[PDB]
Amino acid sequence: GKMFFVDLSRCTACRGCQIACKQWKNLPAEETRNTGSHQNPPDLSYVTLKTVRFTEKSRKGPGIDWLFFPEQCRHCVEPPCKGQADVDLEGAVVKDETTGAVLFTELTAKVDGESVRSACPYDIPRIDPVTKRLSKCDMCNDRVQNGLLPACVKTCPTGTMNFGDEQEMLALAEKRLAEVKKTYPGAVLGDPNDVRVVYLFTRDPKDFYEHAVA
Amino acid sequence: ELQKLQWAKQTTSICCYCAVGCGLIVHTAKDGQGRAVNVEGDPDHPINEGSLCPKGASIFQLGENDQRGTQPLYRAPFSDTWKPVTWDFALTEIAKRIKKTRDASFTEKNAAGDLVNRTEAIASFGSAAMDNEECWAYGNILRSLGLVYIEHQARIXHSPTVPALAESFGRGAMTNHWNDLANSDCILIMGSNAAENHPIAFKWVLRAKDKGATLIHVDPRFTRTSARCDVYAPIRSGADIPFLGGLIKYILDNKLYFTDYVREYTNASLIVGEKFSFKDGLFSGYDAANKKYDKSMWAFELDANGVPKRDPALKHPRCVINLLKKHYERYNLDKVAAITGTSKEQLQQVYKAYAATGKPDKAGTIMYAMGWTQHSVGVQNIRAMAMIQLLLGNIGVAGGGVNALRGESNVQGSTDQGLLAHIWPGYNPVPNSKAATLELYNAATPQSKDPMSVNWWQNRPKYVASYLKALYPDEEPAAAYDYLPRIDAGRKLTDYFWLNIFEKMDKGEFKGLFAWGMNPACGGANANKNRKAMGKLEWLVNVNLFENETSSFWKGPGMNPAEIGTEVFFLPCCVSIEKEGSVANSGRWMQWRYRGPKPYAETKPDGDIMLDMFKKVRELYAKEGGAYPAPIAKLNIADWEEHNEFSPTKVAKLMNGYFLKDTEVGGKQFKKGQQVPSFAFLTADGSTCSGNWLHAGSFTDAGNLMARRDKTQTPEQARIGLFPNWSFCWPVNRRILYNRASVDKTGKPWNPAKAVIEWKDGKWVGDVVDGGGDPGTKHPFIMQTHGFGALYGPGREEGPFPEHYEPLECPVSKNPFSKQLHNPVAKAVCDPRYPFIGTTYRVTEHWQTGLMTRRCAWLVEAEPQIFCEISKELAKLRGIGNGDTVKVSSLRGALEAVAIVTERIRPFKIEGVDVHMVGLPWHYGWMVPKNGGDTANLLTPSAGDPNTGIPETKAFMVDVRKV
């Protein structure tokens, strides 16, 4: 199976990944206002599968600890979203056995939308109020099964985003974690044994987002 | 296979936004016959490797945009509505307006009776966003019309800084390039927010860190850059020179400079004449009545042959290095810490980290873009940067240099093509009224009696002659020299520049304005004044992608169209991916790009617009006569077009140049019609043409070198990432400028592990050597008159050594380094009703005035509204909560914005008083989007810096109040 390694210690919050996700899928933009933050859209939605969250933590000395979190579906190895969806209709949520991606099909309008989201410990699924289908990051499985990197991975300039087979990415995550710890001693990996999107947080993952880790 | 791209033709392009120069791939439906269906990064491009920041990543939304202009739009005087009009009518009427204006305004001779042959009733703005071929032909069309008020983006952000680099090194360009950043051992980012404003650069910045580099960000604010640097040092606005002066003293006191480099490759050994002095913040030769210096008091002591005297022992008390040590001993840590606001701890940490790159096995680079360098001593700020690098041996080496980050995709090229009032293409000056002949013009070039000084500018008569024959191939150069307009010699040079055009605008001295690829209604400071001043125009021609605040100023906020009688023509141009051409990025890479989809609707590339427009002007003069029709009728435009269309390929070949007859230059026979292989083979007798001598080598008989996409590299090239076979950079593919300073006088690199060039087997291996010659036989700075890197730069108006003069007029009253508070060679009101320091900067997601990016829904999604970033201290003082609507006001105007309260802004401690700074983006305008806000330039003053002729947009007094 495939896997993301997301090294947040290199992220410049450029939000190229947020736009590249919408460009590839030709997704519409949300109606957004500025409410005191550069973060926008403020949350994932049916037409926003990835948004970069901004969190400012104070630190003594000059500056702050600015924590950037490009949120996306973790593509769990054992996705609980599939277990809750299989209660109503099997086939609405599908696991690609070659890439490991968890995919929502058009039969998710047949299932209880809010139950599937509540089953996800990362609060990832979003439902359209009209078509009642579920939408989320789909790993760009179309590109992956055609030898292309996901749009958000290819567009990232910093090296935050990495993609490949799960074995080589864990070895990269383990090697990078030991190097990042020299500058950020509280560097941790987000549930590396359960998900295929392995974030490297520079500090407490909860400081990045409430549902950064399960 | 991917259905989205299955039947689409793939082409490559270059990003149309910042000067990083990222490569794209465009997929066009129906095998190139339809619209674009996908735009993303080029994985094979060596700079970005397929990555794109959000602006580049959304170019598909920019091109395939139903808000784009579709056809010319005409606005009759006192009308309140656009009227759609054909291209033929639009260009016929403008050609009538141009001729009617030119005929009634053409002065063949000035008041002194000297030939000028110009018209001063038409001004032109823009543009760094056009192709290099389009920029070059545009400038020549304007000058063939007689214009002298020709300005564009480069004047505002770069021109205050490039004299510092030309004085220091002999050229104004960025010394290294983007990939080279990964070789640095310590990266000092100061006056730049590179992670937001040059985002792909942080690919290489972070790769430097992976190899052990220390990343230092010096900035009054904590930005997205600051989060990814090892050291964030805050500095209060305007304290850059005290900061850098302290580093100079630190380097000199602790003997951390590279002595062998300094002794041989800088002017440290030159003997300054006894007339030089510095006391009480004033250099010698100061005219207190006129607030100007007699620079001849700073001249070097010359030997019996006219060459400046040198003491290679560096012990003479009038040696540059010793006078340098004396000048900067005042900049002790305690004084610098007090004025910068930077802790003494942090200063020592940063000084030690960066000064450690003075060792030959270590390289330090300084990155700046615009920052706050627009004021009078901005040039001295960059001079100090260059001096620090010369002391540490960082100029010409991999991972070193002064990386002055350029702004727009082609602001380098647009400057190279002479879209500034003072320069022809190739940085040959626009002659003044006293340069009555071509011989007198060439006599102004300085000569040098030093056999080791290359002094490459002595070849200028070849470049002026070939440029004139590119324009007029059958007139002899001395005759065609009389065709082009000249400025007044007795007039201040800044009178022809960006700001004075806006002031002459407000005085009704301009009949017509070309707003070509610029948005002056938002980009120019004091928007209220400039928007009302545009109503004083007879006619306005705006060429852009969308209807905008400049096209539609007559129906702007507070405007009554029935009272404004300006006649506005809007001509919609096509986007970058809809046309072929080249753009020159920050590292001078001239990169060719191809058309993806056809031009949308009836939009036209700029080249076709100006060519067809100039042809209408030409034909109307051929059947009506008029004032001085000579330069219009003889202009060589046949080499500009192909198949009834502007030809980017043929223009690029003419700019490179070709032999007009058989000639033997430089021990080689060349036959007529052949392309010129390099500017070394240009002549002055008329046998050679060349639109831009810097382009001689870009398009030879071997093909279009700018279109090279070859990643072939030798081991030494690949180790520092020269990529010599990817595209082409001027001059003659020298990727790292001044690379002769990277080796010793036997040709061995100071840093073999990061060698740029090396003398191996009687040849220079690696980069193209910047200046031919055996090792140890030539001085390394070939464009300098004397050949050395200038620690002492007597060509600067403020003095040969940078000196702190307070840029902040209002809150500061004391200079700890001298008696002189403000620049002695440069009246802000400082009204107490506006006690806060307003400033403007950028965010990653928006571009310039936002004319482009406020039309892309994904970028508006991320940054929908104008904001105002303030400290927690300011918010508590004014009772403003995060997310509240605030009113920011100044003497110039007022606007509303949503407050962003953040610890990323901290109060400045100035003379025992907390001084607060508020930040605003200038990315917004009243047209689009809804609730987006207007431009921050409603608050900025139109009072410009007497030196630079540029207004203040980084430190202007404001008030902010809760609404």
Ligand SMILES: Nc1nc2c(c(=O)[nH]1)N[C@H]1C(S)=C(S)[C@@H](COP(=O)(O)OP(=O)(O)OC[C@H]3O[C@@H](n4cnc5c(=O)[nH]c(N)nc54)[C@H](O)[C@@H]3O)O[C@H]1N2
């Ligand atoms: N995303 C994006 N990128 C752009 C642009 C854009 O509009 N959007 N514009 C392009 C253009 S044309 C230009 S010229 C370049 C400009 O590139 P930048 O110079 O990076 O643009 P700025 O954000 O205006 O200024 C950068 C930093 O200077 C800091 N600063 C302010 N005052 C001082 C000072 O006194 N001393 C020091 N050391 N720093 C100070 C500000 O806090 C800011 O973080 O960017 C280009 N890149």
Ligand SMILES: Nc1nc2c(c(=O)[nH]1)N[C@H]1C(S)=C(S)[C@@H](COP(=O)(O)OP(=O)(O)OC[C@H]3O[C@@H](n4cnc5c(=O)[nH]c(N)nc54)[C@H](O)[C@@H]3O)O[C@H]1N2
């Ligand atoms: N307050 C404040 N003011 C500033 C600044 C600041 O930092 N603060 N920055 C200053 C700086 S550094 C700059 S360079 C100026 C820029 O001032 P402007 O040039 O007026 O900024 P824009 O017009 O928005 O961006 C350039 C234009 O190029 C157009 N364009 C794109 N492609 C093409 C093309 O193919 N052909 C043509 N003809 N046009 C095209 C875009 O639509 C866009 O309108 O703003 C300056 N003003």
Ligand code: SF4
């Ligand atoms: S992997 Fe594809 S779908 Fe998921 S966030 Fe990235 S671009 Fe969007």
Ligand code: SF4
């Ligand atoms: S993150 Fe949530 S939605 Fe995504 S696969 Fe895991 S459980 Fe399902």
Ligand code: SF4
């Ligand atoms: S593209 Fe990369 S650096 Fe930019 S916000 Fe996304 S993850 Fe961070």
Ligand code: SF4
């Ligand atoms: S805006 Fe600059 S950094 Fe971003 S994609 Fe375009 S060229 Fe690259």
Ligand SMILES: [S]
């Ligand atoms: S620029």
Ligand SMILES: [W+6]
């Ligand atoms: W600029």
